[PDB]
Ligand binder design. Structure first.
Ligand SMILES: NC(=O)c1ccc[n+]([C@@H]2O[C@H](COP(=O)([O-])OP(=O)(O)OC[C@H]3O[C@@H](n4cnc5c(N)ncnc54)[C@H](OP(=O)(O)O)[C@@H]3O)[C@@H](O)[C@H]2O)c1
Ligand SMILES: C[C@H]1COc2c1c(Oc1cccc(-c3nnn[nH]3)c1)cc1nc(N)nc(N)c21
Length: 244
C-alpha cells in the first residue's frame, strides 16, 4: 500500500448565499493577524520526523513559497519543495535563498556550541524546485530515498487542488479552523481572495469522513483535542478529514 499524502491548512469559514467557503489567503499572505498557536502547531507537525534520521518534505506552490518573509525561507529543518512553471528561473533564486539560510543556520550552530548547548541529531534543511506536484513527489523520493520522512502538501489553493485531483492512495487533511470571537454575539468574517478548493464536501462529510481527535493525534504525532481554544480575537481548533 502507498504512503499517505497529508494536506495541512488553516481555514476560516465565510458564509455566502450558496454555501460556506473556507478562506485561506488575502493579497498573498494569510487573512488574519499572526496566530502563534497555529504557527507553532504547523512548525512542530511539519518538522516532526516519523522515525529517527528522517526529514519531512513540505510541497508548496511558488506563491506560498513567496508568502513566507525572505529571511525565514526556505523553512528550516524540512525539505522545501517549490512547485512552479519556471523551474529554471526559480531554481536560481531558491539556491540563492537556501545558501543565505545555510549561513544563518551555521552561525547559530557555532554559537550554540560555543554556548555549551547539548547538540543532537535532527532533520536537515533543503530546498528543491520541481515543475509539478507529481514531479515534486518523484523528485523528493529520488533525492532522499530512506532519509525521507513524511510528505505534507502545505498549499496554496492551486497545489491543494492538484493534490486532491491525483489519481488514487490516502489523502488526509489536517485543518486548523479559525473564527473571530463574536461581538455583541455576532461573528464577523475575514476577507479572503483565496479559498480551499473544497468546502461543503468536508463540512457535510460527502466522500470525506471527519476523524476522531485520537486519529488526528496519531497523524500528527502530538495530542490534538479538537476543542476550541481562545487565541486573542480568534478561537481555533484542529481537526482531520480522510477521503472515503
Ligand atoms: N491558510 C493556509 O493554511 C495557507 C497555506 C498556504 C497558502 N496560503 C495562502 O494562499 C495564497 C497562495 O495560494 P495560491 O493558490 O494563490 O498560490 P499557490 O497554489 O501557492 O501557488 C500558485 C503558483 O504555483 C505554481 N503552480 C501552480 N500550479 C502549477 C502546475 N499545475 N504546474 C506547475 N506549477 C504550478 C505556479 O507558480 P509560477 O507562477 O512560479 O509558475 C503558480 O503561480 C497566499 O495568500 C497564501 O498566503 C494559505
Ligand atoms: C507557511 C504558510 C504556508 O502553509 C502554512 C503557513 C503558515 O504561515 C507561516 C508563516 C511564516 C512562517 C511559518 C512557519 N514557521 N515554521 N514553519 N513554518 C508559517 C501557517 C499555516 N498554518 C497551518 N495550520 N497550515 C498551513 N499550511 C500553514
Amino acid at each position: 500500500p502507498t504512503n499517505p499524502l497529508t494536506l495541512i491548512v488553516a481555514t476560516t469559514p465565510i458564509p455566502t448565499r450558496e454555501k460556506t467557503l473556507l478562506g485561506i489567503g488575502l493579497n498573498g499572505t494569510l487573512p488574519w493577524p499572526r496566530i502563534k498557536a497555529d504557527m507553532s502547531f504547523f512548525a512542530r507537525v511539519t518538522t516532526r520526523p516519523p522515525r529517527p534520521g528522517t526529514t519531512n518534505a513540505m510541497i508548496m506552490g511558488r506563491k506560498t513559497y513567496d508568502s513566507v518573509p525572505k529571511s525565514l525561507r526556505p523553512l528550516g529543518k524540512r525539505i522545501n519543495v517549490i512547485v512552479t512553471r519556471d523551474v529554471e528561473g526559480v531554481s536560481k533564486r531558491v539556491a540563492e535563498e537556501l545558501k543565505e539560510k545555510r549561513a544563518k543556520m551555521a552561525a547559530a550552530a557555532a554559537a550554540a556550541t560555543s554556548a555549551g548547548e547539548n547538540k543532537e541529531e535532527g532533520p536537515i534543511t533543503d530546498a528543491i524546485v520541481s515543475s509539478g506536484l507529481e514531479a515534486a513527489l518523484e523528485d523528493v523520493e529520488e533525492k532522499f530515498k530512506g532519509g525521507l520522512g513524511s510528505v505534507f502538501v502545505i498549499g496554496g489553493a492551486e497545489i491543494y487542488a492538484t493534490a486532491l485531483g491525483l489519481g488514487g492512495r490516502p489523502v488526509r487533511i489536517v485543518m486548523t479552523n479559525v473564527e473571530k470571537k463574536g461581538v455583541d454575539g455576532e461573528k464577523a468574517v475575514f476577507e479572503c481572495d483565496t479559498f480551499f478548493p473544497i468546502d461543503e464536501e468536508l463540512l457535510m462529510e460527502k466522500g470525506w469522513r471527519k476523524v476522531s481527535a485520537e486519529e488526528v493525534t496519531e497523524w500528527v504525532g502530538e495530542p490534538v483535542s479538537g476543542e476550541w481554544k481562545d487565541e486573542g480575537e480568534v478561537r481555533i481548533q484542529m481537526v482531520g478529514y480522510e477521503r472515503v
